[PDB]
Symmetry: D2
Subunit: 389 residues, 4 copies
């Protein structure tokens, strides 16, 4: 009754790199028209555009609408952004599906977008500062990366999950090296070409087409990996080697009923059989995908062994190992083309990002059942099982 | 089948006034706690918390989650923020309603929360400013009050509507006084008492309890209303006097299934019979609730004259006068207790604000079928039909 | 040799008080015009204007020249600013004297000006801030009041002196109340009228003439002084009450040779007989007036007992007391009309402010020998000896 | 009477180049240490340090004292900063001479230092902006390079001069290419080695020694110069190419009486025979060197033709050409090793920069009589005459 006709995503850019000066809605616009032409559906035929996005400060009114309008979606349609942190990009898609499961809409474009590069610094200033220094706050760190309850970085909560799971620095780096190698191989073997839609970075002094993930490091090695020093805990295990990076990107999916796609002669990349969102202790948020995926499975009624393919977002090596280690699913079907550690973590769009990677892989290998999950700041997690046709 | 067990709202604060230094989430929490108590539900029974919010920069990760946590809702539950501008507060309810209607949740706390006082200035400084002056941007205006396509204020889109609907300065001034006087009377007669849950402005040097909409000016003389000068157009028709204002606040409703409240023995404030959101020409965004209301009525099978009461958000005196004249609903049953012009307009919370006013004035005079509606920047409208039982 | 033909100062404004929005060069222009008028000297005759000023950030190119031009000093004259911290306004007078002594000028206007209220906050943003909070620095605090070697406020140097000289909280408070009561008495008797030139603060809703020192506290009590909390150390003895304030103002002197004043028939306020500047340990900068005053006295050929009047700037009660204790001059001849604790301390203008007060009191009482001296952040003192003609 | 015992300057760094993150006082301390070492004079013998500096915002209290203390000049000596714009570094040397002439000091280190790269952006925020964007002001542009009376850049004053003296774009471009080619030749030949002291930029990942002027363009062509667009007036003649640059550096001279140098057995770089400063119209400030140089020559009792070598600072080709035209000195003796168009223009330092270049070239070629002169924003010139011992 509710399928995903098509999907697509920009490449993931590196912090202050290829998209260092590109507003999120511009990446979003690209993804909106991309899915449109991939589904063979017109813009005027879109109901609503649902775009998760964690860091909008200063981009102007409702970037979801900015995105929709640039993309070519008519004013007659509606649009909005939503925030479940790095669970936004995927939640948005479950949100999109309900709209149609309720009869409120027929066709929805949903995903997420983020320009971590463009996130400004800010200060509350209306009162005036009679005297003394004041703080210009990094909205990226403050609003995206810092736990509002304990005051420390997500990274720290990985330190807590790690310590909790007795996960060694070596096993973490061990996971980190794999992700880079998997992601590297896939990229050079064009396993990303399908899902990536090139983005044209406009420039007075020449234009540049970006159609590849510039954050994947070629020839990652265990040896060079262990040379790095702790990033968060001065005597901790987490490093800029086994932690996800800061990135820019966008991704999305076209949503219509299964009877709707049929008329259009469209062959959907999957059907949503369920999803779930669950809460855990913020100190150890990285564990959230456990209850998340374990509810999704219970709803779809699937068994952890029945899953063919899974994409479990790689915020931190520590939390990934722990997630997999507990759910006990086949390691060789997890992040087949690499994970966020390598591809990047554009928070807002990560949920739609890994979604694409998931779907376009289920197709090229003939996978039927899958699952895409993510952990969330504040102690949450989002799930969704996909059932190819 | 989907009802609003209870609903509460803080008094609307004035700009830099009552809640000048109070974080939106602190405001939200009050509301969340209140709804639970007013219904009789316990915070631990809460599935998810949904809070619209347009201006959260620098408030830290997912202030929605922050609201639920401070309010008592355990780490088990989920929470998120969403953004549909001034329709955020009402949209959120339609969202929460959907979580249940899709059999995804059991109990939802939905509403909006806003601190336009605590909105900061920002700049993107990552790349650095090589040479020359730059602007620190007021997020409240940039992200909340300015059109992203034309670059002018919502006050100018109202100018557009006033000229295209030919509404004179006198006419608009008339509606402004009318809404003010109604606000002045409805308040003194304690008609706002039920909906308002007092907020405790914690102070190191003197604690303060606020439970009265302070933005309402007493004795609104039509004379001084025609003395002010245009605030947007150097010779326009819109002024501070006939335009809505900057305000703080949080407002919300508890949502469960009609069958759910049945067991709890709760006397419902009403059942949601439909809702809708439609886009209109950006330049004239004010005309949003016009097709948004016909849509919701169309869905509900109700005729405009069948309405027993109406809350049309007063963004401006022009858009207001325009919405009524076209929809042709009895002007006597619209904003019986006043409107945004006099009460205040907490962008993200406004949708719930008026929603609350709707449900309590319905119970007081004994209405069965009403409707709340708001216009949304970028050119959209949101509407929802409420049936008491 | 070189005489002071005339002098003038503005009243001293309180922090963000009377001159809250008045650029320093506007205050300076009024004092330049006053010295000229008082001496019967035309602006066209001025060779150079030299104005000490510690915090000119944002005021534009060379405020000394802006003030001179505003006063009608011809484009063919020159002007410059300089900075020896609180010593600036007196050092400028010494530098002006030297222009005449070496034959490079005939007529100099010299003193200082300062708008502590108008000093901005700042940040170096050229290299960009890739990630993480950064401070907006209060230039008043950072460039005016913080020791660059130890990183603590001048107030902390005040505590160092109090500890070293064993100066009790009670002794410091008595000194402070005494300063206030002397300043209040002098103000009431009219003793600041001769020195002050009124300043017209321009305004759309009326101009305001300022001609009284607004910082002086009328009816200051020892009880309220004693109840103040320490402002720089939890276990300290320096407070808001016994420290000087943050203030705006300007002050100057018109100089020329003694022979020149005779040809003009001017009766000068005094002959510059000697000056000196010497360094001390930054940790006890408040002791600077000791070696500087001794050196100046040595250069003049005077004993301490030879002095008839002294202005020793009151940066803090603690240092003012150390200085008086070490020099041993009769306290009854020092700051006889009160000092900076009562009158204010606009940094760059202070040394010329106290020179004004000294000069006009010498004239009033017929004192023959005077000395002005100030302490200087980073460990210096400056002193000047003046003899009546 | 007063001689320059020794001198030194840092290489001049490009805007945001080698010294992008080096506070001016660090450059200053290296040049102070250098003049001491070059003269055989110990830091403990220094009486005062005087350093021109136009842009010290955010550097902390009195950077002049910071430089001196860092170079080991004792706490008992004194130090101060001054500002006569581009004239500062040369004026400080005349001021330092005057300390010795009046018998108030024996040993002075004087010059200037400037970090245009480190100059911050600022805003006055004590009052408090209620609502809306505000400007962060580039202190370098506002306080260093904008005329205070006319509101336009020094570059516009150059256009004013180009029109009044009828200087074609082609003439200004030829001048600029010649400055570069002369500077490139001198650099390659080693003629800046003597004057330059190397500066060590401290880096966590490696110290870098800077001993070459990095702004000098190697192989500058007329074709590329001719292709540049006017930088200040769309129909003007002044460009990035024929204007001086924005730069960082410091430079100084060690001063003492001729009798003192003899006792020490020092062979001085020169005797200071005269100096002068004079004002002109701000609109044509680049002409200041004309009356200043003429006044200095009169004071020296020298004819223009008596000069053997000239350094006339190249603020802009237009003004440098006008200066040369009006004075009529042989252009073959002016800026023989290139000027500021090629070498850079670290404003507060520039006057002592060109003094250094002058002294070492006089020494090498055996020139008896030299003159250094600079133009000054706001309408001023400064010049100094030097004779070999
Ligand atoms: C001491 C200092 C930090 C205080 O500044 P501040 O943060 O504004 O604190 P205030 O000046 O507002 O004083 C605070 C309180 O003490 C009071 N107070 C000050 N003097 C008082 C007196 N003589 N009697 C009674 N109360 C007094 C205020 O009225 C005030 O009351 P409030 O808080 O209810 O309004 C500041 O003035 C300063 O730094 N002075 C020294 C500056 C300097 O070093 N210059 C160069 C010298 S080297
Ligand atoms: C003129 C000025 C505004 C330009 O600086 P800017 O805004 O940073 O721009 P640039 O310096 O990079 O110059 C721009 C271009 O010309 C080039 N250029 C400069 N000199 C050149 C030359 N001699 N030949 C060929 N190209 C040259 C650049 O490489 C550049 O090309 P790009 O933009 O594609 O990279 C600035 O240097 C200035 O204000 N100078 C005057 C300073 C002053 O007034 N001092 C005191 C005077 S009293
Ligand atoms: O007035 C605005 C327009 O109606 C819309 O922007 C348009 O329909 C779409 O963007 C598609 O071109
Ligand atoms: O108290 C010590 C300082 O002098 C300042 O008061 C402090 O640094 C400000 O509160 C913020 O800069
Ligand atoms: O866990 C309970 C059930 O087995 C599942 O919800 C099932 O898969 C669906 O009802 C669809 O068949
Ligand atoms: O072969 C010639 C050179 O490469 C020159 O540098 C070039 O022609 C000019 O600089 C163009 O402006
Ligand atoms: Na001076």
């Amino acid at each position: 009754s509710i399928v995903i006709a098509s999907a697509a995503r920009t490449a993931v850019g590196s912090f202050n790199g290829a998209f260092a000066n590109t507003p999120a809605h511009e990446l979003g616009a690209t993804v909106i028209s991309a899915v449109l032409e991939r589904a063979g559906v017109a813009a005027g035929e879109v109901n609503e555009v649902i775009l998760g996005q964690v860091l909008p400060a200063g981009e102007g009114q409702n970037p979801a609408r900015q995105a929709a309008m640039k993309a070519g979606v008519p004013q007659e349609a509606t649009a909005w952004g939503m925030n479940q942190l790095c669970g936004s990009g995927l939640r948005a898609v479950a949100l999109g599906m309900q709209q149609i499961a309720t009869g409120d809409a027929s066709i929805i474009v949903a995903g997420g977008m983020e320009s971590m590069s463009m996130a400004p610094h800010c200060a509350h200033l209306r009162g005036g500062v009679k005297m003394g220094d004041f703080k210009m706050i990094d909205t990226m760190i403050k609003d995206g990366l810092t736990d509002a309850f304990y005051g420390y970085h997500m990274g720290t909560t990985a330190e807590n999950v790690a310590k909790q799971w007795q996960l060694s620095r070596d096993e973490q780096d061990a996971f980190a090296v794999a992700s880079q190698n998997k992601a590297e191989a896939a990229q050079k073997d064009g396993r990303f070409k399908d899902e990536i839609v090139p983005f044209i970075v406009k420039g007075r002094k020449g234009d540049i087409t970006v159609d590849a993930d510039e954050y994947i490091r070629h020839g990652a090695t265990l040896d060079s990996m262990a040379k790095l020093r702790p990033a968060f805990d001065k005597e901790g295990t987490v490093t800029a080697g086994n932690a996800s990076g800061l990135n820019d990107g966008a991704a999305a999916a076209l949503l219509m009923s299964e009877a709707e796609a049929s008329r259009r002669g469209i062959q959907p990349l999957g059907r949503i059989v369920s999803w779930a969102t669950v809460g855990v202790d913020p100190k150890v948020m990285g564990t959230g995908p456990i209850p998340a995926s374990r509810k999704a499975l219970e709803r779809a009624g699937w068994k952890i062994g029945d899953l063919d393919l899974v994409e479990a977002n790689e915020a931190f090596a520590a939390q990934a190992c722990a997630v997999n280690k507990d759910l006990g699913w086949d390691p060789s079907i997890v992040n087949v083309n690499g994970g966020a550690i390598a591809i990047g973590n554009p928070i807002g769009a990560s949920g739609a990002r890994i979604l694409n990677t998931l779907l376009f892989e289920m197709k090229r290998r003939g996978a039927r059942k899958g699952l895409a999950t993510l952990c969330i700041g504040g102690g949450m997690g989002v799930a969704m099982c996909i059932e190819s046709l």
